[PDB]
Amino acid sequence: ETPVKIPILMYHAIHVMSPEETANANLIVNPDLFDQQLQKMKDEGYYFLSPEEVYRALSNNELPAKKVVWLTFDDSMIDFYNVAYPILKKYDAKATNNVITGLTEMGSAANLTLKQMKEMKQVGMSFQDHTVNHPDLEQASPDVQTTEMKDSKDYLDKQLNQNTIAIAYPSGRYNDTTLQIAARLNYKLGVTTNEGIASAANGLLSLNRIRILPNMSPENLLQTMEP
Numbered sequence: 001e002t003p004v005k006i007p008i009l010m011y012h013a014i015h016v017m018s019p020e021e022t023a024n025a026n027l028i029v030n031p032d033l034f035d036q037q038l039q040k041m042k043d044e045g046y047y048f049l050s051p052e053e054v055y056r057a058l059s060n061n062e063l064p065a066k067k068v069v070w071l072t073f074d075d076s077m078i079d080f081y082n083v084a085y086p087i088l089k090k091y092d093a094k095a096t097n098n099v100i101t102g103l104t105e106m107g108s109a110a111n112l113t114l115k116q117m118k119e120m121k122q123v124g125m126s127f128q129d130h131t132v133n134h135p136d137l138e139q140a141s142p143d144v145q146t147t148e149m150k151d152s153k154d155y156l157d158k159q160l161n162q163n164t165i166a167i168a169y170p171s172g173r174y175n176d177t178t179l180q181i182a183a184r185l186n187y188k189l190g191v192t193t194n195e196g197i198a199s200a201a202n203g204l205l206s207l208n209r210i211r212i213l214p215n216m217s218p219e220n221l222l223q224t225m226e227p
C-alpha cells in the first residue's frame with residue numbers, strides 16, 4: 001500500500017505591505033492572493049486538516065479525502081487573527097498556528113493573545129508549539145531544549161485546555177537531540193523548513209513543508225501540492 005503524502009503549507013506574514021516593505025523584496029503574501037489560493041483549494045475539493053488528523057493519516061496510512069492539506073502558520077503574529085483568520089472562515093478552512101508562547105505571555109501587541117486563540121479554536125483553528133523564546137534549538141543544551149519545548153507545551157495545554165501534539169522548530173533548525181527530546185515530551189508531529197510534500201518517511205517529528213512564496217499563483221501552488 002503506497003505511503004500517503006500530505007502537502008503541509010508554510011505561511012508566515014499575510015497583510016498589506018507598508019511603504020517601506022515595498023522597497024525591498026520580502027516574503028509577505030498579499031491578502032488578496034491568500035484569498036485566491038484558498039478559493040482554488042476549495043474549488044478543487046481540498047479537505048483542510050487539523051494536527052490530529054495529520055497524525056492519524058500518517059500513522060494509519062489513510063487520507064480522509066482524495067485531496068488534503070495542512071495549512072500551517074508560524075510565529076503567532078497578530079496578522080493571523082486580523083487578516084488570515086477571516087479569510088479562512090470565509091472558505092470554511094481549518095489552519096494551525098505555531099505559537100511562540102513567551103511573546104503571548106509577555107503581552108506582545110505584535111502577537112496573538114490567549115483570548116484570540118480561544119475565539120479561533122471554536123471556528124476551526126489549532127494552536128501548536130513554537131517554543132517559549134524562539135531560540136535556535138540546535139545551539140541549546142539538552143536541558144534548555146527540554147525547557148523551551150516543554151514549558152511552552154504546558155502553557156498552551158493549560159491556558160487553552162488542550163493536549164498540544166505538534167511543534168515547529170524555530171528557523172527549521174534541529175539536531176538528533178531535538179527530536180529525541182520532542183518524542184519524550186509526547187509530541188506526535190514536528191515540522192521543519194525542508195521543502196517538499198510530507199510523508200511518514202520524512203520522520204513524523206521532522207516533516208517537510210511547502211514554503212508559500214509571494215509570487216506563487218494559485219494555479220502554480222496547486223500543481224506544487226500534487227503528489
Ligand SMILES: [Zn+2]
Nearest residue numbers: 015017018021
Ligand atoms: Zn509588515
Ligand SMILES: [Zn+2]
Nearest residue numbers: 074075170171
Ligand atoms: Zn519561527
Ligand SMILES: [Zn+2]
Nearest residue numbers: 138173174175
Ligand atoms: Zn542545523
Ligand SMILES: [Zn+2]
Nearest residue numbers: 175176177178
Ligand atoms: Zn547530537
